Each structure stands twice: as structure tokens, then as C-alpha cells.
Design a protein around this ligand. Structure first.
Ligand code: NA
Length: 97
């Protein structure tokens, strides 16, 4: 039940709670934070001109096959992503790949 601490399903989809580190060598999931209930995501983009947000959304849109929007934390390392029109079961399956 590893990724479950970072996700919740609302009427609109799944809110995936992440904590980003920019300037990374590769955009990828590197861990979970068990106290904050967030997936640690490295993002291979600079945190300028919204480029880390853009890369983060692109990565998860490709992973889930669904539109991903930042609902909270646009200017924070702690960001909540709405994965629109997907279920928690589908998100867990994809995160576990
Ligand atoms: Na950014």
C-alpha cells in the first residue's frame, strides 16, 4: 500500500500529492515521504518560467493517459495534481509499473 498515502479520489479524479525537486538528471519518481504523504518526484527542468511545473504535468499526463492540472502549489515544492477522470485503482496500477 505504498503509494496510497499520496493519493485520494474526489468526484473529479485523483488528487496526487507530490513533492518536487527540480534540476534533476531525469524526471522520475524517486521515493515517497511517509510523513508528508507525498510522492517524491525529480523533475529534469529548471524551476524558472514554470518549466518544472510544465515538465511535471507532461510526465504524469503521459504516465496516466489523462489531463493533469496543478490544483495547489504552483509556486511550491509541494504540489497537488488533479489527474482528471481517472480512478485511484488506475493511478496505483500505473505508479506501480
Ligand atoms: Na516551475
Amino acid at each position: 500500500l505504498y503509494f496510497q498515502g499520496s493519493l485520494r479520489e474526489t468526484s473529479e479524479g485523483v488528487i496526487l500529492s507530490v513533492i518536487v525537486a527540480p534540476n534533476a538528471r531525469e524526471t522520475k519518481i524517486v521515493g515517497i515521504d511517509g510523513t508528508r504523504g507525498r510522492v517524491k518526484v525529480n523533475v529534469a527542468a529548471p524551476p524558472v518560467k514554470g518549466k518544472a511545473n510544465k515538465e511535471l504535468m507532461k510526465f504524469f499526463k503521459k504516465l496516466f493517459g489523462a489531463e493533469v492540472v496543478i490544483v495547489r502549489g504552483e509556486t511550491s515544492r509541494e504540489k497537488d495534481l488533479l489527474i482528471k477522470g481517472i480512478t485511484k485503482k488506475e493511478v496505483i496500477e500505473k505508479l506501480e509499473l
